[PDB]
Amino acid sequence: KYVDKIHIGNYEIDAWYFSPFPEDYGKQPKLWLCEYCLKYMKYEKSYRFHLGQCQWRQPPGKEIYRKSNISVHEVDGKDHKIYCQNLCLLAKLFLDHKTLYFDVEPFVFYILTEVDRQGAHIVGYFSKEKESPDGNNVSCIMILPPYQRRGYGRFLIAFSYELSKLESTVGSPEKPLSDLGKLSYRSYWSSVLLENLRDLSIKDLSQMTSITQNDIISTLQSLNMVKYWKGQHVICVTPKLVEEHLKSAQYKKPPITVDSVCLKWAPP
Numbered sequence: 197k198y199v200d201k202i203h204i205g206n207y208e209i210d211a212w213y214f215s216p217f218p219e220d221y222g223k224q225p226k227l228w229l230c231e232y233c234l235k236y237m238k239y240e241k242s243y244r245f246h247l248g249q250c251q252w253r254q255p256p257g258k259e260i261y262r263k264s265n266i267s268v269h270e271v272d273g274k275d276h277k278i279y280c281q282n283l284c285l286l287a288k289l290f291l292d293h294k295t296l297y298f299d300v301e302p303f304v305f306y307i308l309t310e311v312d313r314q315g316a317h318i319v320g321y322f323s324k325e326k327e328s329p330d331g332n333n334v335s336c337i338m339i340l341p342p343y344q345r346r347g348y349g350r351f352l353i354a355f356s357y358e359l360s361k362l363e364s365t366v367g368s369p370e371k372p373l374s375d376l377g378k379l380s381y382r383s384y385w386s387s388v389l390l391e392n393l394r395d396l397s398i399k400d401l402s403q404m405t406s407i408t409q410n411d412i413i414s415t416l417q418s419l420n421m422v423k424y425w426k427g428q429h430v431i432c433v434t435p436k437l438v439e440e441h442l443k444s445a446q447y448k449k450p451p452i453t454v455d456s457v458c459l460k461w462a463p464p
C-alpha cells in the first residue's frame with residue numbers, strides 16, 4: 197500500500213504514481229509535508245507540531261531570481277542532500293519517468309516559489325545535471341498539480357533557457373516528457389520562435405534562444421514553416437503567416453515573464 201495523498205502547505209493532493217517513500221510512510225492514508233523544509237510525516241499531530249517549530253520560511257540555497265513575489269532558489273544536491281531527496285520523492289508522485297530519488301549530489305535543483313507575508317511557497321522545480329554530456333539543460337521538471345497550467349511551467353521552461361543563454365550553449369530537456377511536458381515545450385518553442393520571426397536562419401534562431409536545432413526544426417515542421425532543399429531544412433515563412441499564427445487561441449494568456457535583469461546568476 198503506497199502513498200496516495202499528500203497534505204502540503206494548505207493543499208491536499210492526490211498522487212499520480214508510486215513514489216518510494218519508506219514502507220512505514222507509504223502504508224499511511226495521507227502523508228504530511230512541511231512546505232519549507234520538505235520533511236514528510238505520518239500524522240497530523242507531528243505535522244502540527246513541526247509547523248509551530250519549523251523556522252524555515254523558504255527553500256535553502258541561494259535565491260538567484262526575485263521579481264515581485266516570484267522567486268527561484270538554487271540548491272546543490274551535494275550541500276542539501278536530505279532536502280533534495282525529499283524533493284525527488286515529492287516529484288516522483290507526479291512524474292512517471294523520474295527514476296533517481298536518492299543520488300542527488302550530481303544535480304542542482306531550481307525551486308520556484310510564490311511569496312506572501314507567510315513565506316515562500318513552493319510551486320514546482322526542475323533539476324539539472326552539473327555535467328550533462330548529452331547537452332540537456334533540464335533533467336526533471338515538475339509543477340505541483342494545483343499550480344499546473346497557470347504559467348509557472350512556462351516560467352520554468354523559459355528560466356531553464358535563460359541559464360542556457362548565460363552558459364553560451366544550447367540545451368534540451370531530458371526525455372521522455374510527460375503528456376503535459378510535451379505540450380508545454382511545444383507551446384513555448386512555438387511562442388518564442390514565432391515571436392522572433394515576426395520581429396533569420398535556423399542556426400541563428402538557435403543562438404538567440406538556446407533551443408537546439410532539432411527542437412527548432414521539429415517545431416517549425418508542426419507550424420509547417422520549413423522547406424527542405426538538398427538535405428537542408430530551410431525556414432519558409434511570410435511575416436503575415438507568422439501573425440495569423442501568433443494571435444491564435446493558446447498565445448493569449450499573459451505569461452509570467454523571466455526578467456534577465458532580476459536574474460542574479462553566473463556560469464561556472
Ligand SMILES: CCOc1cc(C)c(F)c(C(=O)NNS(=O)(=O)c2ccccc2)c1
Nearest residue numbers: 338339344345346347348349350380383384
Ligand atoms: C507533472 C509535470 O508538471 C508540469 C511540467 C511542465 C513542464 C509544465 F509546463 C507544467 C504546466 O503547468 N504547464 N502549463 S503552463 O505553465 O501554464 C504553460 C503555458 C504555455 C506554454 C507552456 C506552459 C506542468
Ligand code: NA
Nearest residue numbers: 208209210341
Ligand atoms: Na488533487
Ligand SMILES: [Zn+2]
Nearest residue numbers: 230233235250
Ligand atoms: Zn519544516
